């Protein structure tokens, strides 16, 4: 019996004295290459974000390519030498694999599974009222850059994903203030910061108060967004992290995330509240109170 009782969100594995953690996410991105990325660099940076999140740092990947028999060879090239450099940025390594050829008429699927060890493991379940809740920088970019894209959209200043390892980002944080500071993360993936948000509120049984005006988002994903008819607040981000911290080391997070290539835009955007536990409350620029609920479905068709 090793584990948790056999059969059937990142999991965490006691091991002795320390933390193993464990992920897999596959990756049906469509097309396989689009502006500031593609699915071999978005492979390796999921799982390498979902790591970070839960205070792993990341030690190994393992890859599964399911390729269709009439992909262009060139194509297959590129998107390892992709999935190899992001790899390598980190560094963590590709230690095993797989490759699957069907007739069947798809380009190209790939899933990765990550390891990481937490000497000081975070969850989503430990904010604490009064923490400050950042975000790592602009929110959104990842899946309306896709969208955008995919409807022929265009800006004078192309919109492109973040997507990005971001360890180095939540590092740079822990080295500065310490674990025991960082109280919940979020890899605000499928269904974006807002559902991040409603799961670290729920997990850790605590409100959330976050102030519209303050979640940091570019205009070319605001556009892109009321064209679509989508919130930023509700697709994929791939080179984010959402972070709670202890109050008294709120500006120290957040300066030490401005001081990253990657975290140069974070900001603080809310605090924890002892009220409403389990929902987050958007105070509107426009003036006024709701609830930020998460996406009610349709889960953007191959983003991520």
């Known amino acids: 019996i090793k584990l948790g009782a056999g059969g059937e969100d990142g999991a965490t594995i ?5 933390h193993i953690v464990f992920t897999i996410d ?26 970070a999140v839960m205070g792993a740092e990341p030690i190994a990947l ?8 009439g ?12 999935m190899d450099e992001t790899a390598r940025e980190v560094p963590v390594p590709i230690v095993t694999g797989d490759t699957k050829v069907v007739e069947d008429k798809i380009e190209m699927f790939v899933i990765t599974a990550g390891i990481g060890i937490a000497e000081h493991p975070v969850s989503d379940a430990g904010a604490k009222v009064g923490d400050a809740v950042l975000v790592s ?5 990842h899946g309306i850059a896709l969208m955008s894209h995919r409807e022929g959209i265009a800006f004078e200043t192309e919109l492109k994903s973040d997507v990005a390892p971001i360890w180095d980002v939540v590092k740079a944080v822990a080295e500065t203030i310490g674990w025991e500071n960082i109280h919940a993360m979020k890899d605000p993936t499928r269904a974006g ?7 670290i509120a729920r997990k850790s049984n605590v409100g959330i108060l976050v102030r519209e005006a303050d979640i ?8 892109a ?5 989508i919130s930023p607040y509700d697709v994929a981000n791939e080179g984010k992290v959402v972070m709670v911290v202890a109050r008294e080391y709120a500006e120290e997070a957040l300066e030490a995330m401005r001081k990253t290539e990657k975290g140069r835009n974070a900001a603080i955007i809310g605090e924890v509240i002892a009220d409403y536990r389990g929902k987050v409350l958007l105070e509107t620029g426009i003036g006024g109170k709701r609830f930020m609920e998460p996406p009610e479905g349709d889960p953007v068709p191959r983003i991520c």
């Open 14 to 18: 006691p091991f002795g004295d320390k």
């Open 26 to 51: 596959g990756h049906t991105v469509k097309p396989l290459f689009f502006p500031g990325g593609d699915i071999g660099r978005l492979a390796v940076s999921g799982t390498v974000n979902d790591l």
């Open 62 to 69: 393992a890859n599964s390519m399911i390729i269709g028999e």
């Open 71 to 82: 992909l262009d060879m060139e194509v297959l090239k590129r998107v390892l030498k992709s």
């Open 137 to 141: 920088g602009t929110i959104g970019d």
């Open 193 to 199: 910061l807002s559902n991040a948000l409603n799961e």
């Open 216 to 223: 940091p988002i570019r205009p070319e994903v605001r556009a």
């Open 225 to 229: 967004s009321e064209m679509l008819g």
